[PDB]
């Protein structure tokens, strides 16, 4: 009791000061978790935005490929058109020579 | 004499347990900051990931623009080709 009275006094505030050092940290994690959920929402939205553009590039390659197979036909038709019909005409119209 | 030699027991409990425990609270602050800084690193990565795929779609859009540009002025070449055929096949009207 000679020296104990102080240790009761001293360690109550040592308890009390750390009694509000816990509330401060609890509010620190409850704001650091909210800042985590803001980041999760952004990345999730940006994860789906990237996914939308993924089949946007896929439909483009579906357009490219089918827009090439058409030119493969137009070049093929011009072979018979410009090559056979035209040259034979001018070879048939060689009568003037 | 009695209530003070005992009441220190309920006081040391806070000072010893919370001294170590609040450190575990501090580690979570670093951990939740590490999670925050890791996702923040990813967000810049995905914006760069957006950037390349932003240009990739634009390059695809120019490829469609160039491809239809061929067709637009390759069907015109066929338009004049059939005019040449019909004009030349109109010549055979003079004979037959």
């Amino acid at each position, epitope marked *: 009791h000679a020296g104990v009275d102080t240790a009761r006094a001293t360690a109550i505030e040592r308890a009390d000061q750390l009694a509000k050092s816990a509330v401060a940290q609890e509010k620190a994690l409850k704001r650091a978790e909210e800042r985590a959920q803001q980041l999760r929402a952004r990345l999730d939205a940006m994860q789906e935005a990237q996914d939308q553009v993924r089949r946007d590039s896929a439909t483009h390659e579906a357009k490219i490929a*089918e827009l090439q197979a058409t030119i493969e036909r137009l070049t093929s038709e011009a072979a018979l058109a410009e090559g056979a019909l035209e040259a034979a005409r001018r070879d048939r119209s060689r009568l003037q020579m | 004499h009695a209530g003070v030699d005992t009441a220190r027991a309920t006081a040391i409990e806070r000072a010893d347990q919370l001294a170590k425990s609040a450190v575990a609270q501090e580690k979570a602050l670093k951990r939740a900051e590490e999670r925050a800084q890791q996702l923040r690193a990813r967000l810049d990565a995905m914006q760069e990931a957006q950037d390349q795929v932003r240009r990739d779609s634009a390059t695809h859009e120019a490829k469609i623009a160039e491809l239809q540009a061929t067709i*637009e002025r390759l069907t015109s070449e066929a338009a004049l080709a059939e005019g040449a055929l019909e004009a030349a096949r109109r010549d055979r009207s003079r004979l037959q």
Partner: nanobody
Amino acid sequence: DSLRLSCASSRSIDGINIMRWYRQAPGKQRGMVAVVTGWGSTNYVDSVKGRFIISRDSAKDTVYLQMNNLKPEDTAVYSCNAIYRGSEYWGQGTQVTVS
């Protein structure tokens, strides 16, 4: 006077590349008349240019060749063409007699 032709496609809703119109003059060979494309680029042959219109209707899966200010020279069997996946598809055809 005036006429109009259709080419009822059975697929390719808006996936429409080149779809063009062919006439086979009676006793002669097939020939192209008008060409339409997915972008809507329409280009005709000199013999019809300024007289005919090749107009798409992407909603109803049909292409349209409006016929205007005709001549009895246009009496021919008119048939439609279509390119999809490179393959060329014709149509059974319809006969147009003008005189």
